[PDB]
Design a protein around this ligand. Structure first.
Ligand code: K99
Ligand code: K99
Ligand code: FKD
Ligand code: CL
Ligand code: NA
Length: 385
């Protein structure tokens, strides 16, 4: 079988975004703190530096209200984020206004420009409407007006994540007209063997063409796609969308190319409780591997499972390994949204939400984000394969 199984298994895990209830909570240099951190995204840059993004949810764990896009980088290009002291303090990409800056969806381009697509909504709008903000204000439902719709923003870094451009609004260009709710990712985009960028979004892929870091963007509309999509290029070189379902059950999968996709259909091999997931191209040479991470349950977010597919079209994934085999203590109950990258030292790097659950499903439940490193051997030597 997989020759990587013969390596010494390795795993390494600790909280990277520490909620307000924890010792040494993560705050900006300006003193700004956050109740909860949610919605992770992680990329390794061409230098080997690792950039980890999240939504800094200022006041509660809710998806609406004042939410800033925060991040951490590894201190050097070479440390691979192996220990807590390897990581810089919390920084901010964008936090302007009392609205929502979220859905981090980064992609590293060939020139090392890091593109970060984001969603935005106004301070007084929420997905469902009639939600109560900290000051008692009742939100309006997100609608199709300019003020009340979800926007699509793009920021980039030319200095290995050190600084970020003021986000530009690309809603009119890259979001279909008449839309209200929208989402990009969250998680990551990809660079294809043939050179294009592909960013998964609600109902569509965003395609980047042309010179690295100077791309032209267009929209590839997808029939039957989900709101929260993932994208990978499979070993056969084709495209693969693996999306969160609208109802609990299974991941929704479609395959295609830049010239078009086939139908979405449930993947019976990948149970999902209606939650975001992540997918990663690990390598293309024998055995070629695609990695997948989600909560492997039709009902629960607390069943995080990392898996490998050796299939040229990622038809079938193995059982993989439960993340709870390498449990983190003192950071709540692991499970929820995730993001993965390959590290510079031949590991998979994963960000995974965790929930203290101190207020149950309520707004005051503190949310933190765990950073994991593990090798293929660790996945393959799991007891349930
Ligand atoms: O055994 C595996 O690794 C697996 F679970 O089943 C494999 C396949 O069905 C045979 O077990 C090996 O040829 C798939 O190719 C793999 O992607 C995976 F799903
Ligand atoms: O959905 C779940 O699995 C859960 F039961 O509820 C989640 C959350 O409170 C609800 O999904 C509502 O947002 C927790 O993060 C999970 O740890 C778990 F408790
Ligand atoms: C997420 C969740 O925790 O379930 O849900 C999305 C969104 O509500 C769903 O995809 C349905 O459209 C939020 O945007 C995200 O912030 C998070 F809460
Ligand atoms: Cl969504
Ligand atoms: Na803000």
């Amino acid at each position: 079988n997989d020759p990587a199984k013969s390596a010494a298994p390795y795993h390494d895990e600790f909280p990277l975004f520490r909620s307000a209830n924890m010792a040494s909570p993560d705050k900006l240099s300006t003193g700004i703190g956050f109740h909860s951190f949610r919605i992770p995204a992680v990329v390794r840059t061409t230098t080997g530096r690792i950039l980890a993004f999240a939504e800094g949810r200022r006041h509660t764990n809710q998806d609406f209200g004042d939410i800033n896009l925060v991040y951490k980088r590894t201190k050097t290009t070479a440390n691979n984020g192996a220990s807590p002291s390897d990581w810089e303090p919390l920084r901010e990409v964008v936090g302007s206004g009392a609205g929502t800056w979220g859905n981090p969806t980064p992609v590293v381009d060939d020139d090392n420009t890091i593109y970060l697509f984001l969603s935005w909504n106004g301070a007084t709008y929420s997905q469902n409407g009639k939600d109560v903000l900290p000051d008692g204000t009742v939100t309006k439902k997100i609608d199709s007006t300019w003020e009340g719709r979800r926007h699509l923003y793009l920021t980039e870094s030319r200095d290995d994540g050190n600084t970020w451009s003021k986000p530009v609004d690309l809603t009119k260009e890259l979001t279909p007209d008449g839309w209200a709710w929208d989402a990009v990712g969250p998680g990551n985009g990809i660079r294809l063997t043939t050179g294009e960028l592909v960013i998964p979004a609600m109902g569509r892929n965003i395609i980047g063409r042309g010179a690295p870091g100077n791309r032209t963007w267009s929209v590839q509309r997808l029939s039957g796609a989900g709101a929260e999509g993932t994208i990978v290029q499979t070993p056969d070189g084709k495209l693969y969308r693996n999306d969160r379902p609208s109802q609990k059950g299974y991941r929704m999968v479609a395959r295609g190319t830049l010239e078009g996709f086939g139908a979405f259909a449930p993947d019976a091999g990948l149970p999902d409780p209606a939650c975001q997931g992540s997918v990663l191209r690990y390598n293309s040479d024998a055995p070629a591997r695609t990695i997948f991470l989600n909560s492997a349950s039709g009902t629960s977010r607390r069943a995080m499972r990392v898996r490998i597919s050796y299939d040229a079209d990622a038809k079938k994934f193995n059982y993989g390994r439960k993340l709870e085999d390498a449990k983190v203590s003192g950071a709540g109950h692991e499970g929820g949204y995730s993001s993965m990258t390959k590290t510079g030292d031949y590991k998979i790097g994963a960000l995974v939400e965790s929930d203290f659950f101190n207020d149950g499903t309520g707004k005051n439940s503190y949310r933190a984000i765990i950073w994991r490193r593990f090798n293929l051997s660790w996945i393959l030597n799991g007891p349930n394969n």
